[PDB]
């Protein structure tokens, strides 16, 4: 890897694109979606949008490889799925551990 470790998959979001067509996508392949994110520790960091984008490039990265010689085939609406709660994830996953490296 590097330098990343997986943080575990989404706890069910019920989470919003604001647009149907990418809701209705959630609900419709998040059976073969990537659910899971992968990072670097938050120790060398200061600031979430540039940590999130290497967060959400390794996970997706890794698990489309993964999920595509399953069977799989990501589309665009897939991706956008993938990028959206990933990095709602890898964002909500900066905030825990930030605080408990600053808790010890
Ligand atoms: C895991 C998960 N992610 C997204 C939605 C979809 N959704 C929630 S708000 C809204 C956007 C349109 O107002 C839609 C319909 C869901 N149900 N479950």
């Given at each position: 890897l590097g330098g990343y470790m997986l943080g575990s998959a989404?706890?069910?979001?019920?989470?919003?694109?604001?647009?149907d067509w990418e809701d209705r996508y959630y609900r419709e392949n998040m059976n073969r979606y990537p659910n899971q994110v992968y990072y670097r520790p938050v120790?060398?960091?200061?600031?979430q949008n540039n940590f999130v984008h290497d967060c959400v490039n390794i996970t997706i990265k890794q698990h489309t490889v993964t999920t595509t010689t399953k069977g799989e085939n990501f589309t665009e609406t897939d991706i956008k799925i993938m990028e959206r709660v990933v990095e709602q994830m890898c964002t909500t996953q900066y905030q825990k551990e930030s605080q408990a490296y600053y808790d010890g």
């Open positions: 989404m706890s069910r979001p019920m989470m919003h694109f604001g647009n120790d060398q960091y200061n600031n």
